[PDB]
Design a protein around this ligand. Structure first.
Ligand SMILES: *Cc1cc2c(cc1C)nc1c(=O)[nH]c(=O)nc-1n2C[C@H](O)[C@H](O)[C@H](O)COP(=O)(O)OP(=O)(O)OC[C@H]1O[C@@H](n2cnc3c(N)ncnc32)[C@H](O)[C@@H]1O
Ligand SMILES: *Cc1cc2c(cc1C)nc1c(=O)[nH]c(=O)nc-1n2C[C@H](O)[C@H](O)[C@H](O)COP(=O)(O)OP(=O)(O)OC[C@H]1O[C@@H](n2cnc3c(N)ncnc32)[C@H](O)[C@@H]1O
Ligand SMILES: *Cc1cc2c(cc1C)nc1c(=O)[nH]c(=O)nc-1n2C[C@H](O)[C@H](O)[C@H](O)COP(=O)(O)OP(=O)(O)OC[C@H]1O[C@@H](n2cnc3c(N)ncnc32)[C@H](O)[C@@H]1O
Ligand SMILES: CCCCCCCc1ccc(O)cc1
Ligand SMILES: CCCCCCCc1ccc(O)cc1
Ligand SMILES: [Cl-]
Ligand SMILES: [Cl-]
Ligand SMILES: [Cl-]
Lengths: 555, 555, 555
């Protein structure tokens, strides 16, 4: 192709063309795709995501967007594309799914970068092992896919998949990002073992036990490395020997991941989702406290989550379908809708897994425990309307993917998500302060507060869901203002964020400045040591290669 | 475009083309302009200046001239043009107006440079603030423009503009040059506060308080830096904190200026221009002495100026309209014309600003003071013919722009100005010696001496106006000879020059050689430290980047 | 000497000794002085300042302190000391007086640095010129000194000195710092012309017209450069030709200054100080507004200043002599003391200079103007008690040095000053907000608010005077907390600070971060370009040489 709408910094159109020309020769035209005009800038749908830019853009739509897209056919092309990238110093921005909405979608930090669609061609479920209770996968496999493969293979009775909400995401893409899931295997990054990745220099590298080579049998001779089998222990024990490098690969530009080992929970032989509606707003506090011990003590098995009232309603309906009002709904109105929906001003969904005797016993403790809360009310999925959010999470908390959840994106007219996600202690006091701070700022911006706590063992990921209409330019600015403000406030009160969208990786990395940004400095050292040319995703997580001046690039 | 008439040193036509090609893609054809042929080399008019070379060329017309011209649309293009310039090592030569005639006009020091017309597109009066009594401006705003904007806005009653003579110049272009003006705010460079400029590396930089960022309001979110607002104090206090760098930006190649804060005098509530004709030639001496104390003591408010007789006549008429003679007019003839015109052999114009009581009082002191001079005669504008130079300066000394002054350029046939401008003490003895030295050399060259002293607090800028016919090649050589000689003589008697034309920046910088050119050496260090590639205006003020050999370049 | 109490980073005692040994050989033992023990750490008196560390230490007393001190005998030694410093990479920290208390005194940013006492030996008033109305000076001359020299020479009738409060400071030390003064020549940095300084490489450099060499007469032959005379125009016109570098020398580590030209106001031939007491606290607001126009309009000639009630009382007496109370005095109590002292809750001191007719006229306007304020009352110095602060400023506003002002340092027991100094618009609204913010934080810290506005043309330097007892460790921490907090708040509201103490140069430079700290980055580039080894005052104004890691050094 000829002329991209925008281009990588410090590069001639004459260069873009030779570069793209060569890629087309490698992956063939079917694979490459240049961004020549506005008609190409379409904001897709979750079902068919756009790989050119951010769908949920708080910023200008055409702000972050690719010079082109390229789907490598397999590892070898990746290695090759990598080498050309080095010759031209062209920036790459890898992605498996493009599903990362509310975090910038497929858009690259630095505009005019070539986006690698790792997913298109490397789509394969490489293995599923019952005894090891794990499977291996390429960037292409979405959760639904895996679920089907288990089901096609009748393996679903043998092993369950853990899943985030919307089931479309890339299993590994979500895992390198350290995304949350609902079953006991909810910590995605925790559950991996052995990875494979292309270095900036294009050299291959397996990790952990991935490194101990499978002995040579006559059948495996001649295989290219990428195609060679892993050793028996690779997917069973993560540590290997010597330094444990895997972390360098999460939320960072250190390299491109090509495959990855992920554990799978053996069917527990028991299950029952449940719900507990908390009547009042302030009940959030005692609730969290009651939970703290139940979590550490293992009463609560999976990653339970406290959901705000609006979140369950948003799934049930549009803001319009409840109030003609154009501003944040009052506490009164909030009390009203819960009455209409049979939910609490806060609602704790979670689950029990195991044989009946364990289940019965835990159920008791849990019910007995939450009773101290005046007005609590316990429902089972059966005990509820056939549309209820509980009837949906019941599948989620058992590895069944769904998409009923996107409906909440629809609260306003032109739906667009944007997640603020600070971390918070498993304390009623801390969780109450955080909620109040996030709420007031939301009110200041004219938006309805909406969110859900996801309970980890010693912490909770507070997920503020900023929905906003993607066409009001003013609203967007307010939103930007909103995010920027919240970040600073939570910072000023000990709260961090575990992930964010492109427009704020820079700001967020600065909050991590203990001892003079020592953490960021150590990274860049690693960064430059590993990728001299800054070819791979510069700016991801705020890490910049020496080539990009922090003055011109930061933001 | 294809082939420039001349080109930058060390560069292939193949390179010029790729470079220009890319610029055309950025600013679009309307903006770029290549110098392909002689028909392009037109010497304009003050009213419509030529951006390709020196209009008043003492040197060969086609000596200093551009390879092309380019008008950036806004800051972003400047940053971009800058980056390409670095890739090719192509020299830039920025300009806002092109109005700098008598100092080489729009012509670049090194030929084949691309000239940046900063003025065309960045034409905006960014702000006018009554309480701060200042305004902000882009390179595009000429004095007339500002005056109109104040007038359109009815603000003229609230704040007055200070102005040099011909009102066409760029307000900032004149200010970075440290040009003189007539009201109390006559020191242009003195009156600025906060600037913005593009470094050779293309990074943006505000200065002084310009650096303290305006807090983030929801309305200002997302704005590109160049478009972001300045903090409240930026334009009110020049110093900021730490080193005061602004000076690196005056009369130098350190960077490109994009906007600048300039003060504005609040309407004084009183005004009356005046004149005092000195009868004899030698009266210059006592006059200067009488003034010295009146300046320090604040009797004389604005920048008054002693004008030679010929200067006022030149405005009134052509040398032809007074004498068929082809050589410098005799003292006798000079005495004659003043009699015809009612002026002295020297004439002191100046002004009073304030309420009547202050005005009356100062007027007394001033009149009483100048009386010691036998034959002095005091006129008010009213007291004079309706063409008188005084009726003109009356507007000048009150911020009203005009253009009546160019008429003096017309003394000879093909008018061309060339300013010699040494500095001189506020002393009758020193001012008399300087005048005599400049005069004799003028006579040696066959030219009529013409000039005006502009009185600063502790010094006077002696401005010799070399008019000469731009077509006599011989006259030109004499002129060159004239300048070269004067520079050395005044040097040999402690006199410096505050500014000059391209053909003598080198010579002039050498006069500043105390301690082995230590001053020049310190600059080049800064120069190279800041612009490794010497992309920005090399040779301006004699400062050369390490790339240009002093042997090949000096002159 | 043998072993310093502390030492420069990255240096062996073996090296310190060879280094010091050599210096002793150059300047001779009388000149050098090593800091071996605690008995050396004495906190002096303003009258006899300590050159080893900070007298007013908010931080630990022995925190910032020298490895030794050295008084160069003259320029040549400076050049020499400089060269050795480069051989060892030993850090220097120059000072003329050591008088900079409330800004860290003589203490260096980086501990174990050698402190250059520029003042001891280079003590000379090099020149006083009546016609040019300026004089020249070495680091050694304090204001009192100059005043005496004018007086000894009977020149006091011919020219007045401008002066800050306490008359002990170095005339140039205060000027490079850009300190404030009271007469019309109150802007110290503004009033200079021509400087001389030693580069990090030890090469000499005159600036401005300083560069144009004085022609060679037989009498001046053979003179070393440092001893050579300046050209006639050097001290009369600051700009010179080409870049105006002087600013690189204010508040920065770019070089050591050895001499400097300073203007002197010709005796005005008229004078009368005055006072106007504002009754209420809130009257600050209308007062500022009434002043704004009087400043721009030139009604108010010199730098007038609005003084808080406590400030005038502190000079009159100890907090003890007014209230046994141990906490901030109430608005009621404040109203009381003013009644006792005959002052307003705010008090505007200022002056008139000129012949009677101008004086009378201005006086009218000023009185008439301030009348709108209910209860205002106008006193002349005569009209007041023989101890009144007005009887003191009357000398200050006429160039007479004094020291009556230190008495205010005595409000608490162990007096120690610490200045917070944000800049503020000449607006009642802006000045009121700033005052309120600074006050509340002061109350939070248990300290009495105390301060004075110093009125510039378009701005006011708000000077918060933090007095605190130098022995309460707790109070100190509160103070540190106080400063840190105020800086951030004023930042968050557009307010900057024009100067500060060592412990906060780093924080203050960070407020200046527009566009990603672009301003700081440009400086360090200049810094390293000019002093490769970071030998000169690293850390001054937060500028660090490449050798000092920002992680280890910042603070
Ligand atoms: C709209 C929404 C989003 C959402 C959610 C609910 C709704 C209504 N619930 C989520 C949940 O419960 N848990 C969770 O982790 N995320 C949830 N989201 C957000 C989002 O939909 C998911 O996180 C989703 O998994 C993200 O998209 P996907 O998984 O497809 O990831 P991607 O588009 O490929 O982006 C991945 C990023 O990581 C880096 N990356 C990706 N692949 C590679 C490879 N091969 N090598 C190196 N780096 C890689 C990139 O930096 C990319 O930005
Ligand atoms: C013919 C004449 C000229 C004249 C005058 C009277 C007559 C009859 N009276 C003047 C006066 O009273 N005071 C004065 O300062 N100049 C007077 N002149 C000379 C001239 O007309 C004016 O000085 C005029 O202001 C100069 O032209 P202009 O103001 O348009 O400046 P320019 O053409 O842009 O050239 C500016 C130079 O400075 C540098 N420059 C300019 N812009 C930038 C930016 N943005 N960034 C960096 N550097 C910049 C260039 O080096 C350029 O050469
Ligand atoms: C306690 C106090 C202080 C004070 C004041 C009232 C009171 C009660 N009133 C002041 C005023 O009205 N205006 C003002 O500017 N300052 C006032 N102060 C503070 C202080 O007393 C004065 O500012 C005083 O002038 C500062 O001390 P001094 O003038 O002696 O300066 P120094 O001790 O030499 O420190 C100078 C700093 O600048 C750099 N420096 C100094 N000399 C050089 C040389 N030769 N070369 C390079 N840099 C130099 C150093 O960085 C040093 O820190
Ligand atoms: C409580 C049900 C969850 C639905 C939406 C979860 C949104 C979400 C999940 C994980 C993230 O890292 C960021 C955001
Ligand atoms: C006395 C009236 C002035 C008209 C012409 C002034 C010419 C001039 C002004 C400023 C310069 O820096 C150089 C030249
Ligand atoms: Cl998802
Ligand atoms: Cl002009
Ligand atoms: Cl002082």
């Amino acid at each position: 192709e000829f002329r991209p709408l925008t281009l990588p910094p410090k590069l001639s159109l004459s260069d873009f063309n030779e570069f793209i020309q060569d890629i087309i020769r490698i992956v063939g035209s079917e694979n490459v795709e240049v961004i020549s005009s506005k008609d190409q800038i379409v904001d897709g749908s979750y079902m068919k995501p756009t790989h050119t830019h951010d769908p949920h853009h708080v910023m200008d739509q055409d702000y972050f967007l690719a010079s082109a897209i390229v789907a490598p056919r397999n590892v070898a092309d990746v290695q090759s594309i990598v080498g050309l990238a080095n010759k031209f110093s062209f920036p790459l921005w890898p992605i498996s799914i493009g599903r990362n909405s509310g975090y910038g979608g497929a858009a690259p930090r630095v505009s005019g970068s070539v986006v690698l669609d790792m997913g298109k061609n490397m789509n394969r479920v490489l293995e599923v092992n019952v005894e090891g209770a794990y499977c291996v996968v390429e960037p292409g496999v979405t959760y639904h896919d895996l679920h089907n493969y288990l089901e096609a293979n009748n393996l679903r009775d043998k092993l369950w998949l853990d899943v985030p909400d919307l089931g479309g995401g890339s299993v590994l893409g979500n895992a390198v990002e350290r995304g949350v899931g609902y079953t006991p295997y909810g910590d995605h990054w925790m559950m991996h073992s052995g990875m494979e990745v292309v270095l900036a220099n294009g050299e291959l590298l397996r990790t952990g036990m991935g490194a101990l080579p499978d002995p040579k049998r006559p059948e495996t001779m001649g295989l290219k490395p990428e195609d060679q089998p892993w050793s028996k222990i690779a997917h069973l024990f993560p540590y290997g020997f010597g330094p444990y490098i895997d972390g360098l690969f999460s939320q960072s530009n250190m390299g491109i991941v090509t495959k990855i080992g992920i554990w799978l929970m053996p069917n527990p032989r028991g299950y029952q989702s449940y719900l507990i509606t908390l009547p009042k707003d302030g009940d959030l506090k005692q609730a969290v406290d009651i939970i703290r011990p139940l979590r550490l003590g293992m009463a609560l098995q999976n990653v339970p989550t406290i959901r705000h009232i609006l979140l369950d309603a948003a799934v049930l309906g549009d803001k319009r379908s409840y109030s003609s009002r154009t501003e944040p709904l009052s506490d009164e109105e909030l009390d009203k809708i819960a009455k209409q929906l049979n939910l609490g001003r806060w609602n704790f969904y979670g689950a029990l897994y195991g044989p009946e005797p364990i289940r019965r016993v835990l159920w008791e403790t849990i019910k007995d425990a939450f009773s101290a809360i005046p007005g609590v009310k316990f429902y089972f999925p059966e005990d509820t309307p056939e549309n209820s959010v509980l009837r949906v999470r019941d599948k989620t908390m058992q590895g069944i993917p769904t998409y009923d959840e996107l409906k909440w994106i629809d609260w306003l007219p032109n739906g667009a998500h944007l997640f603020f996600s600070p971390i918070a202690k498993v304390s009623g006091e801390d969780a109450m302060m955080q909620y109040a701070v996030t709420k007031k700022r939301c009110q200041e911006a004219g938006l309805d507060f909406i969110g859900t706590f996801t309970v980890g063992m010693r912490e909770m990921h507070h997920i503020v869901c900023i929905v906003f209409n993607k066409k009001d330019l003013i609203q967007k600015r307010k939103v930007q203002w909103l995010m920027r403000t919240l970040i600073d406030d939570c910072a000023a009160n000990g709260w961090g964020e575990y992930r964010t969208h492109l427009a704020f990786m820079d700001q967020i990395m600065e909050t991590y400045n203990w001892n003079n940004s020592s953490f960021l400095r150590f990274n860049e050292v690693l960064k430059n040591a590993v990728d001299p040319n800054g070819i791979i995703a510069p700016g991801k997580s705020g890490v910049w290669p020496s080539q990009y001046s922090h003055v011109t690039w930061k933001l």
